[PDB]
Amino acid sequence: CPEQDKYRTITGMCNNRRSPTLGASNRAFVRWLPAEYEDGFSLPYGWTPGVKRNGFPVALARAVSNEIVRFPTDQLTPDQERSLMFMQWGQLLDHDLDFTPEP
Amino acid sequence: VNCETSCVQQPPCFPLKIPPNDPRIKNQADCIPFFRSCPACPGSNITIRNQINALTSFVDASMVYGSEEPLARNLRNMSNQLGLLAVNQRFQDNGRALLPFDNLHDDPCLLTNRSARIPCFLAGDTRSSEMPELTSMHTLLLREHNRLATELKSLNPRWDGERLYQEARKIVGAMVQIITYRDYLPLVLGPTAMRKYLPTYRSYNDSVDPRIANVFTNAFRYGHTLIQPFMFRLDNRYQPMEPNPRVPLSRVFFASWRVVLEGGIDPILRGLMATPAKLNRQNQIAVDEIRERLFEQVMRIGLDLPALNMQRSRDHGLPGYNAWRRFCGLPQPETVGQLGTVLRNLKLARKLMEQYGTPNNIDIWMGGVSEPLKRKGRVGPLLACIIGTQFRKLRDGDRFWWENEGVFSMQQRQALAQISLPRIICDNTGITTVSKNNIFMSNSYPRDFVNCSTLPALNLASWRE
Ligand SMILES: *[C@@H]1O[C@H](CO[C@@H]2O[C@@H](C)[C@@H](O)[C@@H](O)[C@@H]2O)[C@@H](O[C@@H]2O[C@H](CO)[C@@H](O[C@@H]3O[C@H](CO[C@H]4O[C@H](CO)[C@@H](O)[C@H](O)[C@@H]4O)[C@@H](O)[C@H](O[C@H]4O[C@H](CO)[C@@H](O)[C@H](O)[C@@H]4O)[C@@H]3O)[C@H](O)[C@H]2NC(C)=O)[C@H](O)[C@H]1NC(C)=O
Ligand code: HEC
Ligand SMILES: Nc1cc([C@H](CCN[C@]23CC[C@](c4ccccc4)(CC2)CC3)c2ccccc2)c2nn[nH]c2n1
Ligand SMILES: *[C@@H]1O[C@H](CO)[C@@H](O)[C@H](O)[C@H]1NC(C)=O
Ligand SMILES: *[C@@H]1O[C@H](CO)[C@@H](O)[C@H](O)[C@H]1NC(C)=O
Ligand SMILES: [Ca+2]
Ligand SMILES: [Cl-]
Ligand SMILES: [Cl-]
């Protein structure tokens, strides 16, 4: 961790000199609230058949999508105050901030 | 344990089960494939499972330069001392640079068109070929880097390749920061949330944690509600570019061949500027091109992006809607009547309670995108809090924030204040008529369009040494 620098490192290491991995790549996300898992520490809600979440059955993610998200494409409302560049910059910006790897 | 081809729920697979009477998947023994995110501490019975961010959280244009050193070096042209990023050696876009091709062992881009034989592009982030509109933005910034390094070389002929690369990289990162915080975020949050979560910048604060929070990876997916079901391509008169001016999104994912062989990035950038975004409405949340046909061409079954967002928040152990409302200081509805009041919509409140039983269990993405939008914003109060809080930490906790003293001189900061996304398009493409500022609001040709000569350009005079 150098005392004097001029440019960012590629990994983001040393941006915060007191805790030099903060914001650096290949590190765990920070949590703003404690995690909620079926067994408290690793199994996601919906993993075990019949295991409720806070007194209620877990809805299938595809059932929520079918019943709430689904709509007829021809009903689409164009936004009079936003361009499709507004959508695209959001995705480009998201790709500067986070990528969560999978096996 | 192959999550790609099997429906067995065994680590690391967490496949999405199919409900009865599904509109597309009639076989209930089938599934929508899903791999759990890599754990930060694999195999642990002690730690509460957490996930990993493979990128630098900073708004530092890491999607251009890379977040790991071998990749960052591979993206550079090291054949000379010009500080350039490497460009495609096989193809050009009407004489202008294209991203280099990657050398993946399993290349999905090749599948979208057998005869075209156009592989995935190589960029700072691995998703650059996910949709051609995204590829066009990556290509635009690659050109902008080389344009800056070229101008800096003629201004300072003694600067070596490393100096040129680092100085152009610094400018590109600052442009991404300015477009994001000056133009983009006020239109996401709306004016009141912009003042609340992003008050006037003071200085770098080394006690502000700049990490991406786990919840933001799901909350920032609000943008899936803005996605139109087509990729629009327009000619130099902003008219439909025939014979395929509106390609269904399910035929453009990983279609790098369309950038190379169907007209380059100009028709795509024009389509982005002159077509409205989709408006998120309570009964029009997200289109079937991503809800039924996500990556349809390259997978064994089309994926459901909104359902993947919800299964992902579960995989990441994210608390439900009311916990996040409480975190934000917002009231937590307990009944369907109270949820109706939050949403100004009792019909949607009843549909949400029928699925979830309680607003405590509503998945963060689902609850966030159901909220009525803030005035002049495109998220409700909950997503505005999560997004606003994240971007303030990325700004105040970044030692290389463009306005932080020591990063640029005062003269360079004054020159940087004149940059804009329409100007970057002017300087790096064959397009000469672009959206007027704010590009994120402007969407109708010719009403919201101006010639390139009316826009201020980046004056690099204060970079002369
Ligand atoms: C540099 O930034 C620091 C971080 O600031 C945060 O992030 C930025 C981006 C902004 O959003 C900013 O508003 C954020 O606060 C900043 O340091 C922070 O300063 C605040 C205010 O002093 C600290 O809050 C105090 O915390 C203590 C300890 O408890 C906290 O943590 C526990 C555990 O998580 C929680 O359960 C608590 O609820 C608190 O969150 C509290 O005791 C204290 O409250 C009491 O005292 C005040 C009077 O001081 C009373 O009015 C209250 O009613 C209470 O009686 C505060 O809540 C915060 O902990 C601290 N964070 C860090 C990381 O140090 C710093 O000030 C900035 N400096 C400059 C120059 O800008
Ligand atoms: C304004 C924001 C935004 C837009 C627009 C957007 N996304 Fe998302 N998307 C995200 C974020 C943030 C994530 C989480 C990235 C991560 O950490 O891995 C995500 C994740 C994904 C994922 C991973 C799904 C899973 O398994 O959890 C897919 C696939 C995806 N997006 C596809 C797209 C496609 C395709 C488009 C458009 C062509 C798109 N997104 C546009 C923000 C966006
Ligand atoms: N966290 C994420 C993940 C992705 C996808 C995940 C895609 N997974 C596949 C899609 C096709 C596949 C393949 C390969 C060869 C042949 C046939 C299929 C098999 C699964 C390769 C990768 C992605 C991640 C990385 C690069 C681009 C896109 C995102 N896309 N936009 N935003 C995203 N955020
Ligand atoms: C490197 O730069 C030179 C000069 O601009 C160019 O001719 C060459 O194609 C570049 N190489 C790569 C891999 O981009
Ligand atoms: C594949 O690419 C060629 C252009 O080289 C095009 O003519 C052809 O129609 C494309 N096929 C498909 C299925 O898109
Ligand atoms: Ca970054
Ligand atoms: Cl979190
Ligand atoms: Cl190449």
In order, the DSSP letters of B267-301 are: HHHHHHHHSEEEPPBTTB-S-HHHHT-BTTTTSSS
What Å distances lie between residue B238 and A51, B94, B135, B209, B267, CA to CA?
55, 18, 20, 44, 8
Whole-number Å distance between alpha carbons of A69 and B241: 31
> How do B230-232 and B52-53 pair as beta strands?
unpaired
Give helix then strand counts, H and E, for chain A: 2, 2
For residue B96, the 8-state DSSP code is B
Is there a cis peptide before residue B23, judged by omega within 30 degrees of 0? no
Q: Which residues surround ligand 8, an ion (CB under 5 A)?
A: B 88-89, 100-101
Residue B457 burial (CB < 10 Å; 0-12/13-18/19+)?
A: middle
User: Helix or strand or coil: residue A66?
Assistant: helix
Q: Which residue has tokens 């803005």?
A: B226
Handedness of CA A78, B287, B382, B367 (dihedral sign): positive
Single-letter amino acid code for the residue at B174: A
For residue A17, the chain B residues in CB contact (below 8 A) are: 206, 399
Tokens of B282: 């309570």
Please judge whether A76 and B228 are an interchain contact, meaning their C-beta atoms are less than 8 angstroms apart. Answer: yes
C-alpha angle with apex B147: B417 to B413, nearest 5 degrees? 20
Name the residue in chain B with its Cα closest to that of A22. Answer: B211
> Quick one: which ligand is closest to B35's CA?
2
Whole-number Å distance between alpha carbons of B31 and A35: 26
Whole-number Å distance between alpha carbons of B344 and B324: 19
Is there a cis peptide before residue B331, judged by omega within 30 degrees of 0? no
For residue B417, the 8-state DSSP code is T
Residue B245 burial (CB < 10 Å; 0-12/13-18/19+)?
A: middle
For residue B19, the 8-state DSSP code is P
For residue A76, the chain B residues in CB contact (below 8 A) are: 228-229, 278, 284, 287
Q: How many other CB atoms sit within 10 Å of the CB of residue B406? A: 9
**Experimental structure resolution, Å:** 2.1
Give B11→chain A minimum CA distance, Å: 10
Q: Which residue has tokens 């977040």?
A: B67
Give B48→chain A minimum CA distance, Å: 4
Domain of residue A36 covers 1-103
| Nearest to B176, CA basis, from A13, A83, A90, A98 | A90
Phi-psi sector, B44: left (phi>0), alpha (psi -120 to 50), beta:
beta
- The number of domains in chain A is 1
For the domain made up of B1-465, the CATH class stated in words is mainly alpha
Q: Is B130 annotated as a binding residue?
A: yes
Provide the b/e sequence for B300-334 (b: ≥16 CB within 10 Å): eebbbbbbbbbbbbbbbbbbbbbbbbebbebebbe
Whole-number Å distance between alpha carbons of B39 and B316: 9
Provide the b/e sequence for A26-58 (b: ≥16 CB within 10 Å): bbbbbbbeebbbbeeebbbbbbeeeeebeeeeb
For residue B373, the 8-state DSSP code is P
Give alpha helix (H) positions in B225-378: 256-261, 266-274, 288-291, 305-315, 321-327, 336-343, 346-356, 364-370
Exp. method: X-ray
Q: Which helix (H) or strand (E) holds B434?
A: strand B433-435
User: Helix or strand or coil: residue B196?
Assistant: helix
| DSSP collapsed to 3 states, B375-406 | CCCCCCHHHHHHHHHHHHHHHHCCCCCCCCEC
Angle between helices B336-343 and B346-356 (to 10 degrees): 130
How far is the centre of ligand 7, averaged over its atoms, from the C-alpha of B316 (Å)? 9
Q: How many other CB atoms sit within 10 Å of the CB of residue B188? A: 28
Q: Is A95 a catalytic residue?
A: yes
In order, the DSSP letters of A37-61 are: -TTSSSPPTTSSTT--BTTBPPPPH
Give alpha helix (H) positions in A1-103: 61-64, 84-97
Give alpha helix (H) positions in B198-255: 216-219
Residue B80 burial (CB < 10 Å; 0-12/13-18/19+)?
A: exposed
Q: How many other CB atoms sit within 10 Å of the CB of residue B154? A: 8
Q: How many other CB atoms sit within 10 Å of the CB of residue B233? A: 25
For residue B307, the chain A residues in CB contact (below 8 A) are: 61-62, 64-65, 69
Ligand 2 binding pocket mutation candidate from B287, B305, B378 (most atoms within 8 A of CB): B305
Is there an atom of ligand 2 within 6 Å of B57 CB? no
Whole-number Å distance between alpha carbons of B337 and B353: 10
Please tell me the residue having the least CA distance from ligand 1 atom 16. B207
> How do B433-435 and B449-451 pair as beta strands?
antiparallel
Ligand 4 binding pocket mutation candidate from B74, B87, B103 (most atoms within 8 A of CB): B87
Tokens of B200: 């006037």
What Å distances lie between residue B445 and A78, B242, B305, CA to CA?
15, 18, 31
Provide the b/e sequence for B112-143 (b: ≥16 CB within 10 Å): bbeebebbbbbbbbbbbbbbbbbbbbbbbbbb
